[PDB]
Structure formats: structure tokens, C-alpha cells
Amino acid sequence: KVFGRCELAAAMKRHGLDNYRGYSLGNWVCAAKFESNFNTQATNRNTDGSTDYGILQINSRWWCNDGRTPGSRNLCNIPCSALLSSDITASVNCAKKIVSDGNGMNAWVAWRNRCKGTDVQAWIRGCRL
Numbered sequence: 638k639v640f641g642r643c644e645l646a647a648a649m650k651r652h653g654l655d656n657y658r659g660y661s662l663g664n665w666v667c668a669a670k671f672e673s674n675f676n677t678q679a680t681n682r683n684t685d686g687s688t689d690y691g692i693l694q695i696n697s698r699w700w701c702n703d704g705r706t707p708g709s710r711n712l713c714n715i716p717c718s719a720l721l722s723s724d725i726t727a728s729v730n731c732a733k734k735i736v737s738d739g740n741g742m743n744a745w746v747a748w749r750n751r752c753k754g755t756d757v758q759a760w761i762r763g764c765r766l
């Protein structure tokens with residue numbers, strides 16, 4: 638699924654991401670925009686053989702199991718394929734774990750480089766939430 642901006646903002650809110658760990662909703666939508674362009678079936682292979690999965694490009698090095706990332710962990714206890722569903726629950730649930738991990742949203746390199754310190758609230762502007 639390719640979500641709409643405001644559609645995703647709503648879903649994210651419903652799933653409890655708004656101010657989750659201090660991070661306003663706009664931060665999560667901006668991250669999804671630049672990670673996956675709002676597409677739940679986004680995958681991107683990393684140079685180290687790990688792959689990033691779904692709306693928030695969650696990486697198999699640490700967070701999910703795809704059976705092809707040697708020496709990796711599955712800290713979210715999911716198959717990575719769960720991160721590709723039209724239903725964002727598993728993505729959101731794993732992201733709570735990642736953003737709680739200590740570096741906050743800097744875990745998402747695109748959030749750091751493209752969203753951090755920006756008017757992120759623009760991404761939820763005029764959305765019925």
C-alpha cells in the first residue's frame with residue numbers, strides 16, 4: 638500500500654506514534670516520506686547484506702528476521718515480511734522499540750539528514766486526525 642500523507646498521519650496516530658518518546662506526529666510522517674515514500678512494500682538492500690523493510694525501512698541487521706542477514710538479530714521478533722503489510726501495526730510496534738533504543742529517531746538516517754530540525758509539523762497540516 639501507498640498511503641496518503643494525512644491517511645498515514647491518522648494511522649500512525651491511531652497506533653500511538655504521536656509524541657511517542659517525545660516525537661510529534663510530523664516527525665514520523667516526514668521519516669516515512671523520505672524512507673519509503675509512504676509505500677509499505679518498500680525494500681532496500683544495504684551494502685552489508687542487510688535489508689530495510691516497509692514504511693519506516695526497518696533493518697534486518699537488528700530488528701527483524703529475513704533469513705539472509707548473517708549474524709543479525711531479530712529484536713522485534715517478527716519476520717521482516719510483516720513490515721510490508723498494508724496494516725502498519727508491526728512497523729509501528731517495531732519502531733517504538735527502535736526509537737526507545739537510546740539514539741531516538743536518529744536511528745533513521747533520513748530522519749536525521751532530512752527531517753530533524755525542520756518544520757515537521759507541516760507534514761500533518763490540514764489532516765483530519
Ligand SMILES: [Cl-]
Binds near residue numbers: 638639
Ligand atoms: Cl501500491
Ligand SMILES: [Cl-]
Binds near residue numbers: 708
Ligand atoms: Cl538472518
Ligand SMILES: [Cl-]
Binds near residue numbers: 658659740741742
Ligand atoms: Cl530522543
Ligand code: NA
Binds near residue numbers: 699700701702711
Ligand atoms: Na535479523
